[PDB]
Scaffold this active site. Structure first.
Site: not given
Ligand SMILES: CCn1c(NC(C)=O)nc2ccccc21
Ligand SMILES: *[C@@H]1O[C@H](CO)[C@@H](O)[C@H](O)[C@H]1NC(C)=O
Length: 353
Positions: A145, A253, A298
């Protein structure tokens, strides 16, 4: 079990100024080391970081951490649960900086919170070299994640760190799980005027300024000042990296769908979801080490039943073992590029329930 060590350099801190740390289980007969980065969203201003401190405090502070943790999935030491690296030295690094592992700022008279994720990784590597990492043959930096995005942001800096400290023989590699996201068009739209309506690109841009966030140097040089948010998106930062990186990503996801404002599916939403899967598959076409099943889910690598899902009949532990062999030209019956082609969630029968 993995045992807690708080950092000896107490100036490297969690959000609230308490010391950061790591959990360690040594394997004396092994020269392989696994350093895993925990995930858990992020916060990007005073008001939403204050909220996180009330109801997600373990992600902002070490004051309540337990003395031990159980290693699961790829962190398990039982071959029954972990066919890939069960005999490795195991390290779990808790996520307590709320900065996607990018920050380099201390708590001070001008900063209510510290954001030190990038420095936490550097200090953990530093103290582990005195506990046996000096003799390693391979260091795999893994994460799920926000921790998977953290791998992409930090694996080349770990490689540079070990070169500069005099350990050129350690091979640094990365394993990024569920951190490969698209800055795509959302299914429904809202202007960024509060936490829930702020699109990922806008939230990351503000976060970088709030955290003093840092990105890999070759990617920073392409996008230049003010545009560093681009390097948080896998398909943009991956081509700039020199360390070998294996990419694990569900085609549908749940975190991607959440930020896209998707929750009897009619035609507009059917086409949206099918186009998301196709776009993700396209970004992985030239990623030689990857595992991307057509499931709505996820994270995967620290789940105890991570061995169950297969792509074209190959499980993730097997694919990672084939990756190891390829870094000793494709291998008979041992593939490392595994991306589903069917176009809808759970068209792969092995998807988790
Ligand atoms: C889906 C959006 N999202 C992003 N975005 C990026 C550019 O990384 N980072 C995350 C970290 C944890 C959960 C969601 C996250
Ligand atoms: C502690 O970490 C900080 C930040 O990386 C660094 O500047 C400092 O040199 C470290 N202290 C010691 C004693 O190594």
């Amino acid at each position: 079990d993995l045992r807690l060590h708080l950092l000896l350099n107490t100036s490297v801190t969690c959000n609230d100024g308490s010391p950061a740390g790591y959990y360690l289980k040594e394997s004396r007969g092994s020269r392989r080391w696994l350093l895993f980065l925990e995930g858990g969203w992020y916060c990007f201003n005073r008001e939403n970081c204050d909220s996180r401190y009330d109801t997600m405090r373990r992600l902002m502070s070490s004051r309540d951490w337990p003395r031990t943790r159980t290693g699961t999935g790829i962190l398990s030491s039982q071959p029954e649960e972990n066919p890939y690296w069960w005999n490795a030295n195991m390290v779990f690094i808790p996520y307590c900086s709320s900065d996607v592992w990018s920050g380099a700022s201390s708590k001070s008279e001008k900063n209510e919170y510290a954001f030190m994720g990038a420095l936490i990784i550097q200090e953990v590597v530093r103290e582990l070299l005195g506990r046996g990492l000096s003799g390693a043959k391979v260091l795999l930096l893994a994460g799920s994640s926000a921790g998977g995005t953290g791998v992409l942001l930090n694996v080349d800096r770990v490689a540079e760190q070990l070169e500069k400290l005099g350990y050129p023989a350690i091979q640094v590699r990365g394993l990024a799980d569920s951190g490969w996201f698209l800055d795509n068009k959302q299914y429904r739209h809202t202007d960024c005027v509060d936490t829930i309506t702020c699109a990922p690109t806008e939230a990351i841009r503000r976060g970088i300024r709030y955290w003093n966030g840092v990105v890999p140097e070759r990617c920073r040089r392409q996008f230049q000042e003010g545009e560093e948010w681009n390097c948080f998106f896998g398909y943009k930062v991956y081509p700039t990296l020199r360390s070998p990186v294996f990419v694990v990503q569900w085609l549908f996801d749940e975190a991607q769908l959440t930020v896209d404002n998707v929750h009897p599916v009619q035609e507009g939403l059917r086409l949206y979801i099918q186009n998301l899967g196709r776009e993700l598959r396209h970004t992985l076409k030239d990623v030689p080490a990857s595992f991307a099943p057509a499931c709505l889910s996820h994270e995967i690598i620290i789940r105890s039943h991570w061995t169950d899902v297969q792509v074209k009949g190959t499980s993730l532990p097997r694919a990672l073992h084939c990756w190891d062999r390829s870094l000793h030209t494709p291998l008979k019956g041992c593939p490392v590029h595994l991306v589903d082609s069917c176009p809808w969630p759970h068209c792969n029968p092995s998807c988790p329930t």
